[PDB]
């Protein structure tokens, strides 16, 4: 039976990468989280105040509270049969903005551009995405030179 200790098994998780030890460079601290920012948690060894628990590393969630130098952040943690949305108080250093949402906002902005225009025109445009369709009919010109023959090569033992 294994030890219940808080930091058990974070030998690798909380360990600054190769040649990225030392001073926590300052952008990290000086970037602003509001309420409802989508934020991915990633514990860090240098800063031990406000560390998240090893279960929430990797996990993404939303900011609910913002204190002086930390951010309350609702994240969903599964427990055997039940997913528990729960609220944890991570110090900034263990947290980035999750880009996952921004590619969405880019698309909605692009849609609002393509909805305003193409209204006065009349031609309705494809706003929905569509999965990669089968690759269409097309010609391939074997331009002058014929195809290159590939015989499989005879075995030989190298070692």
């Amino acid at each position: 039976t294994n030890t219940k200790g808080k930091r058990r098994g974070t030998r690798y998780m909380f360990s600054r990468p190769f040649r990225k030890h030392g001073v926590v460079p300052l952008a990290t601290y000086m970037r602003i989280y509001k309420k409802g920012d989508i934020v991915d948690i990633k514990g860090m060894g240098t800063v031990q105040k406000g560390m998240p628990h090893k279960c929430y590393h990797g996990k993404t969630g939303r900011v609910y509270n913002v204190t002086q130098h930390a951010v309350g952040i609702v994240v969903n943690k599964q427990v055997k049969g039940k997913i528990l949305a729960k609220r944890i108080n991570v110090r900034i250093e263990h947290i980035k903005h999750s880009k996952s949402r921004d590619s969405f906002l880019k698309r909605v902005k692009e849609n609002d551009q393509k909805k305003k225009e193409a209204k006065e025109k009349g031609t309705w445009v494809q706003l929905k995405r569509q999965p990669a369709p089968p690759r269409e009919a097309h010609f391939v010109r074997t331009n002058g030179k014929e195809p290159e023959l590939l015989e499989p090569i005879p075995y030989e033992f190298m070692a």
Partner: protein, 175 residues
């Protein structure tokens, strides 16, 4: 791979074009298989080994059956192999005598099963080349190279053993 009687297929394909490589080179093969479906698969297997190129990364351009151009000639075919033993992997040069390449490769696949308990999926056919009377290294072939060939069909054992299941006459096997 399994079998039945194979057909030569021509299969040419290319790693599909990109920004960086706009008009990529075509690669052609001789892929013996029971049908185009497994032909194309077999094409991809051989190319994967040789070239950094997968079914996802490429497109088969032209798969097409290839017909023996001299069906009603009797030929001698040299065939080079690459089988897998229980032990290590090997090379051979088999020789068959047949009316077709397909027939000659089919013939090979049966022989290899017989003589080496080698199953389809172990065998790689590299080259199949029709060959003269000479340049035939195997005496099992060479004995049929002769103008006035002459042999009997000596102990001609009967079939139709159950047309008359029972009969008065003891049979005959001299003809």
């Amino acid at each position: 791979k399994a079998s039945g009687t194979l057909r030569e297929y021509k299969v040419v394909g290319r790693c599909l074009p990109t920004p960086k490589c706009r008009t990529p080179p075509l690669y052609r093969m001789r892929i013996f298989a029971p049908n185009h479906v497994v032909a194309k698969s077999r094409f991809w297997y051989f190319v994967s080994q040789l070239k950094k190129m997968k079914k996802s990364s490429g497109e088969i351009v032209y798969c097409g059956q290839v017909f023996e151009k001299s069906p009603l000639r009797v030929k001698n075919f040299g065939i080079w192999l690459r089988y897998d033993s229980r032990s290590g992997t090997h090379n051979m040069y088999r020789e068959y005598r047949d009316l077709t390449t397909a027939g000659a490769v089919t013939q090979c696949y049966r022989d290899m099963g017989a003589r080496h308990r080698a199953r389809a999926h172990s065998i790689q056919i590299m080259k199949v080349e029709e060959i003269a009377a000479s340049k035939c290294r195997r005496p099992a072939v060479k004995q049929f190279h002769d103008s006035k060939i002459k042999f009997p069909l000596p102990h001609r054992v009967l079939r139709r053993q159950h047309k008359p299941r029972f009969t008065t006459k003891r049979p005959n096997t001299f003809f």
